[PDB]
Amino acid sequence: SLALSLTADQMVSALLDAEPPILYSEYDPTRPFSEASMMGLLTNLADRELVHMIWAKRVPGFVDLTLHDQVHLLECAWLEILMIGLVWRSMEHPGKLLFAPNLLLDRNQGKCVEGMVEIFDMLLATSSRFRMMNLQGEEFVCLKSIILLNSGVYTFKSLEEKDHIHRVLDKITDTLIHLMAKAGLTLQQQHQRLAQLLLILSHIRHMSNKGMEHLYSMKCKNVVPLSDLLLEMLDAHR
């Protein structure tokens, strides 16, 4: 496939160009929050972001997969993808989460919703880590693509596809390393940084699992009307 024939620089360009748009919240900043109000804004935002995430089709190698496999990967990874995006854009806002350019929430506003501040703290901790590492945009798009292809790859006559995904994953690794070499990092520093970035994906998985459980609890309580799309995505995890 074309994915394997891409140069490292062509991969970064492809990923950069595939980036989804930054959406705004319907947030009206002249009205205090309520638990329902807050959940409404965040879920409404997430639902709209999901449509745009389906970016996925432009991730090199993804279009090569069967409709079935694409569905599986997205169902597995969608909240991880939203979260790493959120953490990324919150990087330069210490102590805050930039859900949208017009919806910047500090930690304490997590308490507006039961059990959510715990989620906020985890996202904020990851953001601080990205900030500490000086995570670059080129590296971020690489990590997000890895999440898409990796998260559900082990939950699969079709062994050729799984191997193709692993070849694509290797290419993204090559791409990360290429960026680090270009940035002047020594060999030892390249491997160290690569490890550091990928270990963060463990924490992102953790946050997604926690968020999925929280989103589910809010659902059952009928504290917020979730879109049909969001309900189906959630249903895939239970």
Partner: peptide
């Protein structure tokens, strides 16, 4: 079937 199915086929 799934909305996700429909979105993927209709991706732009």
């Amino acid at each position: 079937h799934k909305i996700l199915h429909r979105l993927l086929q209709d991706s732009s």
